[PDB]
Coordinates of C-alpha atoms in Angstrom, one line a residue:
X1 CA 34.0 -67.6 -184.5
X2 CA 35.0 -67.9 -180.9
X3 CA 32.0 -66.0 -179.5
X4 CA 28.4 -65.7 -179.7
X5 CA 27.2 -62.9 -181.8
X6 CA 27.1 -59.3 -180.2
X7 CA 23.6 -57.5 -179.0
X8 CA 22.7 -54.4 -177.1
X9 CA 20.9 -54.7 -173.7
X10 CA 20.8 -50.8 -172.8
X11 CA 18.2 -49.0 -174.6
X12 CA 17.2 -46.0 -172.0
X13 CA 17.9 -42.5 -172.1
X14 CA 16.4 -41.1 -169.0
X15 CA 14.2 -38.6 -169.2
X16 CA 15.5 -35.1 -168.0
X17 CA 12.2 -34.6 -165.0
X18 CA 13.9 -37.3 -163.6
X19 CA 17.5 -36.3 -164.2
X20 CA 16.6 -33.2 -162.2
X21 CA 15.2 -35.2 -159.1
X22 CA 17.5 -34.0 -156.6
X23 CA 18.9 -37.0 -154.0
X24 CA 15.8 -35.9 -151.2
X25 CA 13.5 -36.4 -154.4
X26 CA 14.9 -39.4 -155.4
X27 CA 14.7 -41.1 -152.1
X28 CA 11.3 -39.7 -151.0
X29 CA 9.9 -40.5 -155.2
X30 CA 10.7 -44.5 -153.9
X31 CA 9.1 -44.2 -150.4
X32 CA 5.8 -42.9 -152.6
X33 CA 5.9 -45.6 -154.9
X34 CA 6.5 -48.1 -151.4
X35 CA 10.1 -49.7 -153.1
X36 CA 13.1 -50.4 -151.7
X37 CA 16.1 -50.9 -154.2
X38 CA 19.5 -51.9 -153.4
X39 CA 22.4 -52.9 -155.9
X40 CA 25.4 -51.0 -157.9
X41 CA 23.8 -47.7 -159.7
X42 CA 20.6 -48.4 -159.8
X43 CA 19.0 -46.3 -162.5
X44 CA 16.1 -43.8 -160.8
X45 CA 12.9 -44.9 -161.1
X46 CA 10.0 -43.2 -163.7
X47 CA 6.6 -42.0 -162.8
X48 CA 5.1 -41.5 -166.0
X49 CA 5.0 -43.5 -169.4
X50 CA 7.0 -40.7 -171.1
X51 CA 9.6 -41.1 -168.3
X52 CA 10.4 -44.7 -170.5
X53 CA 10.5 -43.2 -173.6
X54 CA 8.3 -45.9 -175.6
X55 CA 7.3 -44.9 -179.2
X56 CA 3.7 -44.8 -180.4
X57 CA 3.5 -48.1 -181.4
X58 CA 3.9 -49.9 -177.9
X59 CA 1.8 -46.2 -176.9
X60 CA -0.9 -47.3 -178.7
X61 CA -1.6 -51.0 -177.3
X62 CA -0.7 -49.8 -174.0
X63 CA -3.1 -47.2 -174.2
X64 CA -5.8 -50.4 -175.5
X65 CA -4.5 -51.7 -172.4
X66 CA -5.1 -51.9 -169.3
X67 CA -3.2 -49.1 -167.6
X68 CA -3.5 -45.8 -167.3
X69 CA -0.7 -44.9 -165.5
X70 CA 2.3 -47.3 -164.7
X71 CA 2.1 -49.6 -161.7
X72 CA 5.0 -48.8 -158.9
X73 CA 7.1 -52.0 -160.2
X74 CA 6.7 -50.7 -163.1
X75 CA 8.2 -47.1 -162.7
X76 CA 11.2 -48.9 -161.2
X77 CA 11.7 -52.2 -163.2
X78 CA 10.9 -50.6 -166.6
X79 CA 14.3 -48.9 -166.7
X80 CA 16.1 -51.0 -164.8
X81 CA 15.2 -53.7 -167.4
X82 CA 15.7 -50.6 -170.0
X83 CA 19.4 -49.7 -169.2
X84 CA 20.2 -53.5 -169.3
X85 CA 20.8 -54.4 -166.1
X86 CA 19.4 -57.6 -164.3
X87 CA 17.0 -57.7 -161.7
X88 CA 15.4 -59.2 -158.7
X89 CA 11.9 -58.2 -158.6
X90 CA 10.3 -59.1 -155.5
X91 CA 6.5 -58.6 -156.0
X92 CA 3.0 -60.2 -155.7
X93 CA 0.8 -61.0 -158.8
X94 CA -0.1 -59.2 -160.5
X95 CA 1.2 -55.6 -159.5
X96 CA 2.2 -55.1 -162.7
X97 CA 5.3 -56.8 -162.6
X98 CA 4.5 -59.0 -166.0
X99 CA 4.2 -56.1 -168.0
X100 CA 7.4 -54.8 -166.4
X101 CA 9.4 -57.1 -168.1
X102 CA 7.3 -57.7 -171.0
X103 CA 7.7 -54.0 -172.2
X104 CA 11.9 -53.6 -172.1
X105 CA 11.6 -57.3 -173.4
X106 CA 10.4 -55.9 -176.7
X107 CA 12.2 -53.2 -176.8
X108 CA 15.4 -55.8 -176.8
X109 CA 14.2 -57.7 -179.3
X110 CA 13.6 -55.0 -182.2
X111 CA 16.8 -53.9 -182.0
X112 CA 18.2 -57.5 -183.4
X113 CA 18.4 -59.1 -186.3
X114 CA 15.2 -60.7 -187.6
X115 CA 14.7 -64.5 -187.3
X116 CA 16.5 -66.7 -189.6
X117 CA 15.0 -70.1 -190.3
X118 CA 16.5 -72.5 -187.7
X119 CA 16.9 -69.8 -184.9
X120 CA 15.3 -70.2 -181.5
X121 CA 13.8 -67.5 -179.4
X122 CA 15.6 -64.3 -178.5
X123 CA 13.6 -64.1 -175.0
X124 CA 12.2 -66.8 -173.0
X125 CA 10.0 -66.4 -170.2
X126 CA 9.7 -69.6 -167.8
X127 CA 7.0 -70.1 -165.5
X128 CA 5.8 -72.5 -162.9
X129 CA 2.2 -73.3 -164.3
X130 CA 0.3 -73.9 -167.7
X131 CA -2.0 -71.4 -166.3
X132 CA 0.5 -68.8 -165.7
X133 CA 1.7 -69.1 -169.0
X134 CA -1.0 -69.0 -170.9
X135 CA -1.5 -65.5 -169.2
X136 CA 1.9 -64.3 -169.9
X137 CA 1.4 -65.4 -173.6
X138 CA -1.7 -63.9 -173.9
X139 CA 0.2 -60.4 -172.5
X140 CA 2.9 -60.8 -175.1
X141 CA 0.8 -61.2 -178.1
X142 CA -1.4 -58.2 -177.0
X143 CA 1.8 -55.9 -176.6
X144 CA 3.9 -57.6 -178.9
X145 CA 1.8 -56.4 -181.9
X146 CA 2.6 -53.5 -181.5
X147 CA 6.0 -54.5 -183.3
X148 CA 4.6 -57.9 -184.8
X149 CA 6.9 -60.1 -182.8
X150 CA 5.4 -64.1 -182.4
X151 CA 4.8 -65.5 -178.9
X152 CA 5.0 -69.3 -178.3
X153 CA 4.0 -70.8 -175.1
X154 CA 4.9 -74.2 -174.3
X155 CA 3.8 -75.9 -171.1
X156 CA 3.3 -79.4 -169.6
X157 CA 0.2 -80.8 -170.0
X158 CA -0.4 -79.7 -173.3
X159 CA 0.1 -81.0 -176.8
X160 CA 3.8 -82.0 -177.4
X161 CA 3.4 -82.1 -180.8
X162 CA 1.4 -79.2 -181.6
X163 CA 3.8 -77.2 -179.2
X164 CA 6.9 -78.7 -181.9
X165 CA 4.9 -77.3 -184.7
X166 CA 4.4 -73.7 -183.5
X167 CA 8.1 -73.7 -182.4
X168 CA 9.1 -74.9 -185.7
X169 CA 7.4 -72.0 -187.9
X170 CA 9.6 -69.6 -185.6
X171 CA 8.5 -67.5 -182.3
X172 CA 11.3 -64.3 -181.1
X173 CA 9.4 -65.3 -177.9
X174 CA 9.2 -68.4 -175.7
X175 CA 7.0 -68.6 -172.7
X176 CA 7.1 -71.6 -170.9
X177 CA 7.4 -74.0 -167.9
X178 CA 11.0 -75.3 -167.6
X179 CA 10.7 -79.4 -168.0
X180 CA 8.9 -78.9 -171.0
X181 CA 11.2 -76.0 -172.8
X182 CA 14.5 -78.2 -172.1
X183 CA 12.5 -81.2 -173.3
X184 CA 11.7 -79.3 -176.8
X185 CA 15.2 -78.1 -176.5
X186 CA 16.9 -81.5 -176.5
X187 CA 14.5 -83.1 -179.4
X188 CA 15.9 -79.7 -181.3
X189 CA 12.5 -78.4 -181.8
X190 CA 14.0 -75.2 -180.6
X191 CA 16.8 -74.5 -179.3
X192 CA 18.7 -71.8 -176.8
X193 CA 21.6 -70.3 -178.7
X194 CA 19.5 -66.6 -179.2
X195 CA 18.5 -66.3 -176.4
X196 CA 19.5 -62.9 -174.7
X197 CA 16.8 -62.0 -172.7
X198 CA 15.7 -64.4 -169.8
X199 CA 13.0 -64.3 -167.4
X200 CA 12.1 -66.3 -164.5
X201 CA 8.4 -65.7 -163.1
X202 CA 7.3 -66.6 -159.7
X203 CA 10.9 -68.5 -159.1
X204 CA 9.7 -69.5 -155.2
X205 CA 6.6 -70.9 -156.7
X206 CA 8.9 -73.0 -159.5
X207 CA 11.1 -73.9 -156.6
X208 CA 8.1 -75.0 -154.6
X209 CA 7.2 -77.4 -157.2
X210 CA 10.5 -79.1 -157.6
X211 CA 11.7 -77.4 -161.0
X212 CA 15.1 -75.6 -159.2
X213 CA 17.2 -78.0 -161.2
X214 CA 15.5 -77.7 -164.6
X215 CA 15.4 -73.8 -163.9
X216 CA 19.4 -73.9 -163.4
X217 CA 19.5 -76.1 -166.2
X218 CA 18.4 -73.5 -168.3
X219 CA 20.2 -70.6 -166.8
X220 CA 23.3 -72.6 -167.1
X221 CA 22.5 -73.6 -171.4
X222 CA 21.8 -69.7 -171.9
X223 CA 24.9 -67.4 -173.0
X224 CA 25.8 -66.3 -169.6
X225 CA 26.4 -62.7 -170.8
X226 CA 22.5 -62.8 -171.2
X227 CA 20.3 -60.2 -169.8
X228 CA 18.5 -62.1 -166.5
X229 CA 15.3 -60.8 -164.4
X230 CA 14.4 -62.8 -161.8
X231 CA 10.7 -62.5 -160.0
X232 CA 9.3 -64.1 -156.9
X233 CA 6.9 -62.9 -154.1
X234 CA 9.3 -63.8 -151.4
X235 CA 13.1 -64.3 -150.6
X236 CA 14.2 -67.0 -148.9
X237 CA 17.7 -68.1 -148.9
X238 CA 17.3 -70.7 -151.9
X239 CA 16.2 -68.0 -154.0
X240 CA 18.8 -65.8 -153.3
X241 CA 21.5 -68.1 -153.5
X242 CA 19.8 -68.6 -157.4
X243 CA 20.0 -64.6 -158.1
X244 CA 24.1 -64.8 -156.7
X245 CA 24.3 -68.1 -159.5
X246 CA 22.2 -66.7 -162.4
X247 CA 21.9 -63.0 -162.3
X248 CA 25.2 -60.7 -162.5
X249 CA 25.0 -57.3 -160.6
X250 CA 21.1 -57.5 -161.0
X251 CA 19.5 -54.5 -159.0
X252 CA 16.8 -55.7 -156.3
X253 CA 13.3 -54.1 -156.3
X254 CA 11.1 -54.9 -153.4
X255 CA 7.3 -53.8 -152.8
X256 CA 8.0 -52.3 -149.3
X257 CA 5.2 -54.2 -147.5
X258 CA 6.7 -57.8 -148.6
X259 CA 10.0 -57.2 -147.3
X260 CA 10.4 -55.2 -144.4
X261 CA 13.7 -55.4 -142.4
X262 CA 16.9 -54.0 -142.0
X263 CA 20.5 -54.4 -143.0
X264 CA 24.0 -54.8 -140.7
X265 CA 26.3 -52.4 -140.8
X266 CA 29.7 -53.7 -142.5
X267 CA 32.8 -52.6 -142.2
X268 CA 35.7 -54.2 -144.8
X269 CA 39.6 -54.2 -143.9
X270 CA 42.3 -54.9 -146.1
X271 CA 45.4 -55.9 -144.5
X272 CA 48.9 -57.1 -145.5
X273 CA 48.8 -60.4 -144.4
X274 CA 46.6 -63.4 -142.4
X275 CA 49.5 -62.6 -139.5
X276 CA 49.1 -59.0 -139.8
X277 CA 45.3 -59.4 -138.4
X278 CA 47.0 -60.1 -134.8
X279 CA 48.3 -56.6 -134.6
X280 CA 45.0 -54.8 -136.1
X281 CA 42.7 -56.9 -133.3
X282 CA 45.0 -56.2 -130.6
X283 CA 45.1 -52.4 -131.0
X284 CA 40.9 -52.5 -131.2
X285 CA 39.4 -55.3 -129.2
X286 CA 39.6 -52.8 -125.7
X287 CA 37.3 -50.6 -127.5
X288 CA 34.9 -52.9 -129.2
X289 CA 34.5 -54.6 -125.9
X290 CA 33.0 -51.1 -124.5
X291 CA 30.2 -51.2 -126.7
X292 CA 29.2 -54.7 -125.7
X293 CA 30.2 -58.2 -126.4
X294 CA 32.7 -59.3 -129.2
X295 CA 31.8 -62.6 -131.4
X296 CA 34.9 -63.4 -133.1
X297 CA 34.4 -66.3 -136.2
X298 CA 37.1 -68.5 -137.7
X299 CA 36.7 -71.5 -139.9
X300 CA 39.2 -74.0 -138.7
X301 CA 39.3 -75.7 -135.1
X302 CA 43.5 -75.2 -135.1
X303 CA 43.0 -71.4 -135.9
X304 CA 40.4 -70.7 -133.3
X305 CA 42.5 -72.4 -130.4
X306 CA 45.5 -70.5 -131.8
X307 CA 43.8 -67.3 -131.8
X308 CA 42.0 -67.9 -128.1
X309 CA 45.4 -69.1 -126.8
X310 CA 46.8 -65.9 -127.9
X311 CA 43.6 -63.5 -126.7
X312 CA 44.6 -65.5 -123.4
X313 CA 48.3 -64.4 -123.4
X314 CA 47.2 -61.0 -124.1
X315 CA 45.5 -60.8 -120.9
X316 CA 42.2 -60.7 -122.5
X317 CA 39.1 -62.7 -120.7
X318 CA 37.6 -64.7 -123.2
X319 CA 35.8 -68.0 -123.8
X320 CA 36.7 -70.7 -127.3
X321 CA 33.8 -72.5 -128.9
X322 CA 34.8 -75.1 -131.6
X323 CA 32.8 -78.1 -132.6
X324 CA 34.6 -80.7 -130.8
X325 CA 33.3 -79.7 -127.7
X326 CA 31.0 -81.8 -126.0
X327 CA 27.3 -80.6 -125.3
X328 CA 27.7 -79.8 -121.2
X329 CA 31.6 -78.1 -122.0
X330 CA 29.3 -76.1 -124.8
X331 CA 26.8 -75.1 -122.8
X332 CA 28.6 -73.5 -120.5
X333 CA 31.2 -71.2 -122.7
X334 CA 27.5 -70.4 -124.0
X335 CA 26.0 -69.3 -120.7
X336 CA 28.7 -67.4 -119.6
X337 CA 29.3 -65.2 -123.1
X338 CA 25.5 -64.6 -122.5
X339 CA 25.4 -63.5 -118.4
X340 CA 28.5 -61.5 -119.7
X341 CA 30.8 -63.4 -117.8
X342 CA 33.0 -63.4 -121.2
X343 CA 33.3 -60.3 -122.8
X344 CA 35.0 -61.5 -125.8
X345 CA 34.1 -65.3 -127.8
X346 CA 36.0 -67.0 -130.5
X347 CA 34.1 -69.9 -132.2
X348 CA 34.1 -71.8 -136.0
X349 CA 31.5 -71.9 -137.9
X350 CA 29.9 -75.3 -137.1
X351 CA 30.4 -74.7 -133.9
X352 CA 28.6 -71.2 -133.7
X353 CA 24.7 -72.6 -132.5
X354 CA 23.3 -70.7 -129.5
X355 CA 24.9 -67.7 -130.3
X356 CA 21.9 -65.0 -131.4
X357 CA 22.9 -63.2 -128.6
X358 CA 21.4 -59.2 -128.4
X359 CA 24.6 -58.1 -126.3
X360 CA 27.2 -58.8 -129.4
X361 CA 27.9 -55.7 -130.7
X362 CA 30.6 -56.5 -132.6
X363 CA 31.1 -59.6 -135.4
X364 CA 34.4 -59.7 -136.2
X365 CA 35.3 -62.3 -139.5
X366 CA 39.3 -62.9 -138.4
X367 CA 39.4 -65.9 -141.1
X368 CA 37.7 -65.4 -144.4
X369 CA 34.1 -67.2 -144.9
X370 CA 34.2 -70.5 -147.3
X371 CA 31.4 -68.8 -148.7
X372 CA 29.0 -66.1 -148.9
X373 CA 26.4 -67.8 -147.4
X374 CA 28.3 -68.4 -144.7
X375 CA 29.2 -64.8 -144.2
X376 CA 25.8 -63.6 -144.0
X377 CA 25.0 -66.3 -141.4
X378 CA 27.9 -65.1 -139.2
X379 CA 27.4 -61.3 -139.5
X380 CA 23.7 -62.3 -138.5
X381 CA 24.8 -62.9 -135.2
X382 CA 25.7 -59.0 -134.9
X383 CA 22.9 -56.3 -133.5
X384 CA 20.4 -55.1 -135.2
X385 CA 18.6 -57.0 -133.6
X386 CA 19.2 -54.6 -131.3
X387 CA 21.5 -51.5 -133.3
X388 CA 24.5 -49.9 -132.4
X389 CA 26.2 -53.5 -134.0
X390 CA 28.6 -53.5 -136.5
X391 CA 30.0 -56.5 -138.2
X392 CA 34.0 -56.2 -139.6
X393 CA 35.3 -58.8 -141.9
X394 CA 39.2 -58.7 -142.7
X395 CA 41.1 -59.1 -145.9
X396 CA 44.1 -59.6 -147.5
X397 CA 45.6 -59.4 -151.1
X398 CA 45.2 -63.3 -151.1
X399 CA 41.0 -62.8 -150.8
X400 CA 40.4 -61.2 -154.2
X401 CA 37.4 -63.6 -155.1
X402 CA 35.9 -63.7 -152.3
X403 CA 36.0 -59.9 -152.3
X404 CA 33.9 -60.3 -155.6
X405 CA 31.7 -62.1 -153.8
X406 CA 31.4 -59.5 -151.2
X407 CA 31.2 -56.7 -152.8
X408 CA 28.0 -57.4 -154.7
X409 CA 26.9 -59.0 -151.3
X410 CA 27.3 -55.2 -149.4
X411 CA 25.7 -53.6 -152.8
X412 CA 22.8 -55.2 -152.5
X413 CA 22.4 -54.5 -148.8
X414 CA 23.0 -51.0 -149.8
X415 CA 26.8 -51.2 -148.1
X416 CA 30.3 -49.2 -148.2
X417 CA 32.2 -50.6 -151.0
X418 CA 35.7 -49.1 -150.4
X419 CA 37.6 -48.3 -153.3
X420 CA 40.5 -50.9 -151.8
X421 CA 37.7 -53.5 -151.9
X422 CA 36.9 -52.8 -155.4
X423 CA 40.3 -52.5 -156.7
X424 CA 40.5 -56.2 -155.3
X425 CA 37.6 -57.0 -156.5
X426 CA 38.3 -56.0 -159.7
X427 CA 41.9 -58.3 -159.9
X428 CA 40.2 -60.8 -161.5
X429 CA 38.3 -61.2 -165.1
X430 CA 35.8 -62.9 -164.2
X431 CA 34.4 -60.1 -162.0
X432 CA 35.9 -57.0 -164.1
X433 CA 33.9 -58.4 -167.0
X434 CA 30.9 -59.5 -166.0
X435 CA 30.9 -56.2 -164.0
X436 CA 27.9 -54.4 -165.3

């Protein structure tokens, strides 16, 4: 009585052709199908409809369908979706992707107990536009027969009341736009608590039409140990900030032409102590200074001066830049890191404009981020823009939920997690948990 009711989420058993891929196979199978994927394990991607194991049932409309061998998202998605992991998908219309989640979607719901009268949906599907849903709806109900499972769609601009009805006589799918499912859900024409499977469709677009907060809204009513796939055609920081707050170690899947590149090289310390840093920088900063200029970041103004005071002592030549500087005193710590002047530059955060710089080589986080947005603004400012740039971030036993935080950050940028870094990681329940 203290939990929600258990469910499965991993219904793959990979098929043995793809068991055999060898690691050159694997990696040249995604360059055919044009995907990059990044995240912990990600399962190997199919090529073929028996490669997802569906029965002859689903076979059988898919064969009615529509396809006649899967789409690229598809081969990929189907078992990430399968094996029960969340996803990013990003994706144009309509490559495919709707069926992509439709089809594992299905799959989770047959394995659970039937509806009882009173219980909402077991998926939901949200989506920015009437239009769009009526297209997903129309998707489900096609493959969804295959198993007789009831679709409802409910979207703004259609009947209220007829939408209260159709909920009412019981769906094991929602599709929807999100102001009008949380609006059913808080007249208790539906309601949430089944919910186990969660899609969210073109997620820039919703965002582009103001929904982010009803999105979250939902995301944030669903049991969080949910299942989560998350589309959009783009990434842009507000969407991938959503993924870190509503998707637990998803894997990403990106069409390689709506991407692109290319990811910094990372390099994760753990020390003893914030004082034992001094001693670890000293014994490297000569050689990272012969490979080009060395950006170091703090957060706070007293730490930065400390630590340029002592870089002084040490007989380094280096320049400070903290935010109480005025604009000409600014300028010129700038102008001189750039002509090369300075070899070696400490700055805080807020104080760090002016420094995309090709010559840094080296980005060196002495004090921790506040967050991880912040970190992948600072190790930005490393090369590759120009590679042969590597960014190190130090730790110590006191940084264990950041480390969380940056572990999934260097897994989905396809980075060294350290085995230190994920036993510190892994201190803390609410990342050894929710740990796929």
């Amino acid at each position: 009585h203290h939990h929600h009711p258990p469910f499965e989420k991993n219904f793959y058993n990979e098929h043995e052709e793809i068991t055999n891929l060898t690691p050159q196979q694997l990696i040249d199978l995604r360059h055919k199908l044009n995907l990059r994927v990044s995240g912990a394990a990600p399962p190997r991607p199919g090529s073929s409809f028996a490669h997802f194991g569906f029965d002859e049932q689903l076979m059988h409309q898919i064969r009615k369908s529509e396809y006649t061998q899967p789409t690229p998202i598809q081969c990929q998605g189907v078992p990430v979706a399968l094996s029960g992991r969340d996803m990013i998908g990003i994706a144009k219309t309509g490559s495919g992707k709707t069926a992509a989640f439709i089809w594992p979607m299905l799959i989770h719901i047959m394995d659970q107990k039937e509806l009882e009268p009173g219980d909402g949906p077991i998926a939901v599907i949200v989506c920015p536009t009437r239009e769009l849903c009526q297209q997903i709806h129309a998707e489900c109900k096609r493959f969804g027969k295959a198993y007789n499972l009831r679709s409802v769609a409910v979207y703004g601009g259609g009947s209220m009341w007829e939408q209260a009805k159709a909920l009412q006589e019981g769906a094991e799918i929602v599709v929807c736009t999100p102001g009008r499912l949380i609006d059913h859900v808080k007249k208790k024409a539906t309601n949430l608590q089944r919910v186990s499977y969660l899609v969210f469709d073109e997620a820039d677009r919703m965002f582009d039409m103001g929904f982010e907060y009803q999105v979250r809204s939902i995301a944030s009513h669903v049991r969080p140990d949910r299942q989560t796939l998350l589309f959009s055609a783009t990434f842009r920081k507000k969407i991938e900030k959503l993924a870190r707050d509503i998707l637990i170690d998803p894997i990403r899947v990106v069409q390689g032409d709506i991407g692109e590149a290319e990811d910094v090289t990372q390099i994760v310390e753990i020390l003893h102590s914030g004082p034992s840093k001094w001693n670890w920088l000293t014994r490297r900063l000569v050689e990272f200074t012969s490979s080009g200029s060395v950006l170091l970041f703090v957060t706070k103004k007293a730490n930065a001066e400390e630590l340029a005071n002592n870089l002084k002592q040490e007989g380094h030549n280096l320049g400070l830049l903290h935010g109480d500087m005025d604009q000409s005193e600014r300028n010129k710590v700038i102008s001189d890191f750039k002509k090369k002047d300075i070899p070696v530059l400490v700055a805080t955060d807020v104080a760090a404009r002016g420094l995309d710089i090709p010559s840094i080589k080296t980005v060196i986080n002495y004090d921790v981020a506040r967050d991880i947005d912040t970190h992948t603004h600072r190790i930005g400012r490393t090369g590759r823009a120009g590679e042969k740039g590597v960014a190190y971030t130090l730790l110590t036993p006191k940084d264990s939920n950041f480390a969380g935080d940056l572990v999934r950050n260097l897994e989905g940028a396809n980075q060294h997690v350290s085995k230190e870094l994920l036993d510190l990681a892994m201190q803390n329940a609410w990342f050894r948990k929710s740990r796929f």
